Design a protein around this ligand. Structure first.
Ligand SMILES: [Mg+2]
Ligand SMILES: [Mg+2]
Ligand SMILES: [Mg+2]
Ligand SMILES: [Mg+2]
Ligand SMILES: [Mg+2]
Ligand SMILES: [Mg+2]
Ligand SMILES: [Mg+2]
Ligand SMILES: [Mg+2]
Ligand SMILES: [Mg+2]
Ligand SMILES: [Mg+2]
Ligand SMILES: [Mg+2]
Ligand SMILES: [Mg+2]
Ligand SMILES: [Mg+2]
Ligand SMILES: [Mg+2]
Lengths: 51, 55, 129, 88, 100
RNA sequence: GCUUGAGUCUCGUAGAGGGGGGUAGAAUUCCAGGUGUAGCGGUGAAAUGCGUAGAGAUCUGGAGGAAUACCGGUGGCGAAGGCGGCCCCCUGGACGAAGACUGACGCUCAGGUGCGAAAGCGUGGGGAGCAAACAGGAUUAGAUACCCUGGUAGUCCACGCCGUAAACGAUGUCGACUUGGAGGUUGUGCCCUUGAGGCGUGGCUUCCGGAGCUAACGCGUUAAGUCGACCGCCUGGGGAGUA
């Protein structure tokens, strides 16, 4: 979220943003409510994540 | 874990952001990941820990 | 719910058998015994055994001939829901003679072969071949 | 769910010695006790439909145990409902 | 008799009323023959986020054994009382000592 | 009469089980103000819409309603419906460890009764966001749509109606019996606690898989296997869950 990054380097170095926010909870909340269908959606996040 | 007052042991179960850390990272047991959260929550309510890095 | 003990026998056998299991136990009773008898007598099991006083416990030894088991089919015939009673002239004869039908008469728990000889009838407990 | 204190007191009050915990008479009173208590719980609230199931349960139970006793010792039975105060 | 953890936070300006407060809540609980198994005047501590505006605030940990009644009034007086900007009476499960 | 079925008692354990009251932070909308200046917003592209009465953007202080990120999980709880911030109060069930009481007090259940998602109805309240209706803007041959700008009921609370869902595991309840393997969860006994453990012994659950079963698909000790007790229900499609 935050980066100090003091002296030597003009490279952004903010790969932290790909560690939480962004398309994370922000693609999530962006649209169709869901409500019970995430249930189904996450039942593939495990019907897959078994192997 | 054993308590919310343990902001010490506690502070190594949350990200910079303040967000609780999944059990799949901590390798924490089950029973305890709950004891943990329920104490981090408590710590959050009692201004003993931020909900947010906004503060 | 344990409302038919005899089927629980007929079946503890049936299963244990199909599971090529040597032994088999269960809570006993006079009625269980008298049948284990006919099963031994007529030779569908090695021998029975009741071990205990407070809470008696039928124990049966299963026979196996070739690879197969000796009991090809054990089936209840009477039962709580629907009881059966054949006279003497109407007693059944399983597998055309081969195998047998347990039956309880006023003179004890016999086979069809028996009860026919005994000249009387009873409740046909179950079939066994 | 009914103090160890009170629960004990009733065993003591209905069965033989304490320890005669499962005496017909004693269960009936032990339930009775809880049932009645519960009336004030469901007075307030009323919407507590789930917990209500447990209470009805309580009564299906007692009602069954009471029926049993009556078949056994109607004397013990009569005494019991006079003593608890139910049937009307 | 039930235990509770309990801990409130007094507004800085109203710090000086903390001694009397504890004095009071104690005499209130002991009053109904309830034990007082811990007490810890954590004093002005700094806050994780600001709250009611204003940072830092006086803390008071205090484990107790008392009837579910004096516990009630306590919870309310924490409302009646503006000076207390948070409180939280907790769990139970037997007394406790020292920790922190 | 019996004690194993079933009950009761002691102690604990886990839990989004139920009901009530408090309370928190993040966001959104809105009100007031600082700064700031001509665009914002929206789409596939647009337009309606919003902004020179200063919008959007940014900072600050407020108000209100709604839902509770992370934890979070083939995790958990309940009879089904369904139940996710945190705290207290009230309360149901479940489970486990010892023994102790009761002594078949059980199982199932037409009728009956209770419960029962969302939408819907009645009275008051409440109303941020969403959104049937409806209005506008597009698209299209047409566009009563999908898209966009708006937006009412409703979605929220109390009280009371309604009683239905693909209310599904499309698998009634209970009981006994029948090879295994890898997990998740949650109790409990023992072990130089000498390990973040070692071996056991329960309840629950996910995935495979054996016999067996199956039209096949598949199920497979949580059976759709082997058996019993009771209940519900089916009897070609349409007509009709209608008259
Ligand atoms: Mg009999
Ligand atoms: Mg805000
Ligand atoms: Mg603001
Ligand atoms: Mg409970
Ligand atoms: Mg109803
Ligand atoms: Mg509704
Ligand atoms: Mg209404
Ligand atoms: Mg619209
Ligand atoms: Mg229907
Ligand atoms: Mg379903
Ligand atoms: Mg297995
Ligand atoms: Mg399988
Ligand atoms: Mg079956
Ligand atoms: Mg009709």
């Amino acid at each position: 979220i935050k980066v100090r990054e003091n002296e030597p380097f003009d490279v952004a170095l903010r790969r932290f943003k790909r560690s939480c926010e962004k398309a994370g909870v922000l693609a999530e909340v962006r649209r169709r409510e869901f409500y019970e269908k995430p249930t189904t959606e996450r039942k593939r996040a495990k019907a897959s994540a078994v192997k | 874990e054993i308590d919310y007052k343990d902001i010490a042991t506690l502070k190594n179960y949350i990200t910079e952001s303040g967000k609780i850390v999944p059990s799949r990272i901590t390798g924490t047991r089950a029973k305890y990941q709950r004891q943990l959260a329920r104490a981090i929550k408590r710590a959050r309510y009692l201004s003993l820990l931020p909900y947010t890095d906004r503060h | 719910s344990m409302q038919d003990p005899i089927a629980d026998m007929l079946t503890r056998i049936r299963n244990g058998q199909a599971a090529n299991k040597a032994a088999v136990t269960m809570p006993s009773s006079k009625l269980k015994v008298a049948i284990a008898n006919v099963l031994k007598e007529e030779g569908f099991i090695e021998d029975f055994k009741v071990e205990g006083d407070t809470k008696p416990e039928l124990e049966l030894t299963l026979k196996y001939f070739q690879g197969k088991a000796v009991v090809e089919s054990i089936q209840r015939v009477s039962r709580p829901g629907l009881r059966i009673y054949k006279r003497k002239d109407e007693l059944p004869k399983v597998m055309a003679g081969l195998g047998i039908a347990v039956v309880s008469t006023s003179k004890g728990v016999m086979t069809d072969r028996a009860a026919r000889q005994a000249g009387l009838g009873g409740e046909i407990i179950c079939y066994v071949a | 769910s009914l103090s160890t204190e009170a629960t004990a007191k009733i065993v003591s009050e209905f069965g033989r010695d304490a320890n005669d915990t499962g005496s017909t008479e004693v269960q009936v009173a032990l339930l009775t006790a809880q049932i009645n208590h519960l009336q004030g719980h469901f007075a307030e609230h009323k919407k507590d439909h789930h917990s209500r199931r447990g209470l009805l349960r309580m009564v299906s139970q007692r009602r069954k145990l009471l029926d049993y006793l009556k078949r056994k010792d109607v004397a013990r039975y009569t005494q019991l409902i006079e003593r608890l105060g139910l049937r009307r | 008799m039930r235990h509770y953890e309990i801990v409130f936070m007094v507004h800085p300006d109203q710090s000086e009323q903390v001694p009397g407060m504890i004095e009071r809540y104690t005499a209130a609980i002991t009053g109904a023959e309830g034990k007082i198994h811990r007490l810890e005047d954590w004093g002005r501590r700094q806050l994780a986020y600001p709250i009611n505006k204003l940072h830092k605030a006086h803390y008071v940990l205090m484990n107790v054994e008392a009837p579910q009644e004096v516990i009630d009034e306590l919870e309310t007086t924490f409302r009646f009382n503006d000076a207390v900007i948070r409180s939280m009476v907790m769990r139970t499960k037997h007394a406790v000592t020292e920790a922190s």
